[PDB]
Structure formats: C-alpha cells, structure tokens
Ligand SMILES: C[As](C)(=O)[O-]
Ligand SMILES: C[As](C)(=O)[O-]
Ligand SMILES: [Zn+2]
Ligand SMILES: [Zn+2]
Ligand SMILES: [Zn+2]
C-alpha cells in the first residue's frame with residue numbers, strides 16, 4: 423500500500439494534498455525488512471490522513487543526499503512539501519501512531 | 528541575540544508575531560558550539576522575518592517530548608504556531624539560507 | 633537487571649572482558665520509555681553473555697560527548713573497553729538478538 | 738593506499754595477518770567525500786600496523802548486512818578476524834588518530 427518514490431518523481435509526490443511519510447531504506451538494512459510489514463499496515467489504516475512512501479537509497483542518491491540522511495532506516499514526514507519530522511531508526515507501530523498523532527487528528 | 532525558551536514560556540513564544548526558529552540543544556551536543564556563530568549571524572541577517580531562540584533539552588523535557596525530538600541539534604521553524612520545517616544536525620550558513628528561503632516569505 | 637552508569641563510574645564499568653551494552657537515553661525520549669522493558673527482559677535473559685547498562689544523557693554530558701551521540705536512543709556495545717557496535721534508535725527484542733548475535737554465545 | 742573490498746574478497750582481507758580498517762560508504766553519504774583524503778593519509782602514516790579499505794554498501798549488500806551497518810559512514814577496525822572498534826560519522830584525521838592509533842599498537 424506504499425507509494426514508491428524515485429529521485430525523478432519525488433518533488434511531485436510531496437506537493438500533494440496529504441502529508442507524506444517517506445521511508446528511506448535499503449536491502450542491506452536488516453531492521454528495514456522487519457519494519458516493512460508494520461509500515462504497510464500503518465499505511466493501510468491511515469491512507470485517509472497520510473501517504474506512506476518508500477525511497478530506495480541504493481538507487482536514489484540525490485534525494486537521500488538532499489535531506490542529509492545519516493542512518494538507515496530514517497522516515498521523514500512531509501507537510502506542505504517540507505520536512506517537519508525525522509524519525510530515526512526502527513519505528514514500532516506505537517511510535518508511528520504517537521509521532522504522527524498530529525497529522526492523524 | 529538568541530532568546531532562551533523553556534517549557535514554561537514555550538507556547539507563548541511560538542504564538543508571537545514573527546516565526547520562531549528554535550534550536551533544541553544539549554550540553555553533550557557535537558556540532559552545537561560550531562553552530563552557535565552561524566545561528567547568531569543568521570538571526571542578525573533576518574531580524575525582521577524571524578526570531579532565533581534556543582531550548583536546552585537537558586532542562587526542558589516537556590517541549591522536547593511534545594515535538595518528538597530525538598536528534599541533537601534539531602532546528603524547528605514555527606510559523607502558524609506549528610512546525611513548518613525541521614532540520615537536524617549541523618547546518619552551515621548557506622544550507623540554513625537555502626533550507627529556510629521558502630518558509631520565511 | 634540493568635546497572636546505572638554515570639560520568640563518574642563509566643570507565644570502570646567498561647574496563648572488562650565481559651561485553652557491556654550501554655543504553656544512552658533521555659527523559660524526553662518517548663521511544664526510550666517503550667524500550668526500557670524490552671531491554672530489561674533482554675538483560676535478564678542474557679546476563680551470562682552481556683551486562684546491560686543505562687546512561688542518562690541529560691546528566692552525563694562527558695561520556696555522551698566522548699562517544700559522539702547524535703540521536704536518542706543510541707545503544708553502544710563495548711568489548712575490551714572499546715565501542716564495537718552503535719545501535720541507532722529503538723531496538724525490538726529481535727533486533728537486539730540479531731545485532732548482538734556474536735556476543736550471544 | 739586503501740583497498741577496495743567487495744563481498745567477494747571481504748573475508749579474505751579481514752581474516753588475515755594485520756588489522757584492517759573498513760570504511761562502509763555510499764554515494765549519498767554527506768561527509769564521506771570530505772573524509773577520503775583523511776582516511777588515505779591516516780592509512781599511510783600507519784601502513785605497517787593497519788590496512789585501510791573501503792566498501793561500497795550498495796554494491797556489496799551481503800557484507801553490509803552481516804555487520805549490521807546502519808550509519809553511513811561506518812568505520813570498523815578488524816583485528817584477528819573480528820571487529821575490535823567501530824566509529825560512526827565524519828572523523829577528521831586527529832580523531833582517527835585519537836580513536837584508533839593506540840588500538841593498533
Ligand atoms: C606514527 As605517528 C607519525 O601517527 O605518531
Ligand atoms: C601517535 As602513535 C601511537 O602513531 O606513535
Ligand atoms: Zn493506526
Ligand atoms: Zn536569508
Ligand atoms: Zn538470545
């Protein structure tokens with residue numbers, strides 16, 4: 423249920439009418455795998471409030487560099503086309519709920 | 528030229544006239560000292576469009592908690608009484624300028 | 633099941649052959665609260681392989697700066713008095729098992 | 738003089754004679770470009786004591802995943818056949834000196 427973003431379609435994605443939660447991940451990132459199902463389900467339950475997207479850092483160096491990613495996983499919540507929150511590391515469902523409580527209001 | 532905020536006066540502060548760029552810092556912070564001058568100059572050059580302030584996370588957990596802060600430093604531009612943009616880590620002069628050019632007009 | 637470390641007793645605590653996992657946490661860190669119980673069960677179940685400890689970054693800026701902490705929760709595994717692993721962010725029970733696979737033998 | 742390590746020749750390098758310092762990097766890494774000359778010079782000044790190598794995480798997902806890499810860059814010093822110390826993020830030459838020189842004899 424997650425939208426797949428690329429260096430090419432990134433800007434378009436975040437200029438949308440719904441906040442966008444972007445998962446910066448990689449295949450080599452063990453925690454990212456474990457997190458995928460949790461994020462997918464999170465996406466399914468709140469598609470009415472936020473769009474959850476994923477960006478493969480291995481294939482999109484431009485966007486990853488632009489937002490200064492330092493560690494993988496890293497999720498950035500975009501509102502109005504700007505980064506307003508940056509979640510570092512594994513995010514359990516309870517934290518996604520708590521951190522995006524505002525956009526989910 | 529850098530207002531000090533606390534849990535007690537924080538709410539009032541972000542409800543002021545000008546947008547407020549809040550630097551959440553900690554004594555253990557790595558690039559904060561290296562950032563102090565950058566923020567001073569930034570404040571000096573944008574006195575009319577923004578108020579630069581600092582919040583020591585070591586002594587103000589409530590606000591730090593509320594805004595889901597995890598990285599130090601974290602800069603959050605408040606406009607409309609809510610975060611409109613957030614930057615983490617060391618932000619040099621030009622990057623600060625490029626990143627904020629769009630939320631200060 | 634979890635010893636408390638400070639700037640004053642930190643060096644002594646890591647000066648041994650038995651691995652020590654140090655959770656660098658803060659009062660303002662929501663995730664950290666959610667993880668305390670996961671860390672506690674882990675400590676109890678692997679006391680024979682690793683010593684689990686906590687260091688409150690708000691009160692211990694020396695050690696925290698020494699190891700270059702940038703975000704909170706950060707757990708550092710020490711072996712032979714040197715940091716051999718830095719786990720960034722929330723660590724679910726399974727990630728702790730995976731990540732510390734080596735020491736758990 | 739730094740070696741380029743791959744999933745193919747990785748074990749062969751870290752398993753032998755002298756210590757091996759591996760720089761896990763990525764094209765999107767912020768401080769990696771800046772760190773390149775620093776790693777090269779530190780390597781030369783301690784060539785008898787350590788072999789310095791680079792591993793692109795994108796191109797070599799297996800080794801990256803095996804060592805639980807999360808932050809880019811991550812430096813891991815291998816002794817015998819295992820990690821004896823890890824550093825994350827940008828490191829100027831004097832920090833590589835302060836952090837690794839003593840552990841290299
Ligand atoms: C061996 As030297 C020049 O780093 O003291
Ligand atoms: C500073 As040295 C251990 O390379 O003589
Ligand atoms: Zn939900
Ligand atoms: Zn300007
Ligand atoms: Zn176990």
Ligand SMILES: [Zn+2]
Pocket residue numbers: 782783834838
């Ligand atoms: Zn030296």
Ligand SMILES: [Zn+2]
Pocket residue numbers: none
């Ligand atoms: Zn010397």
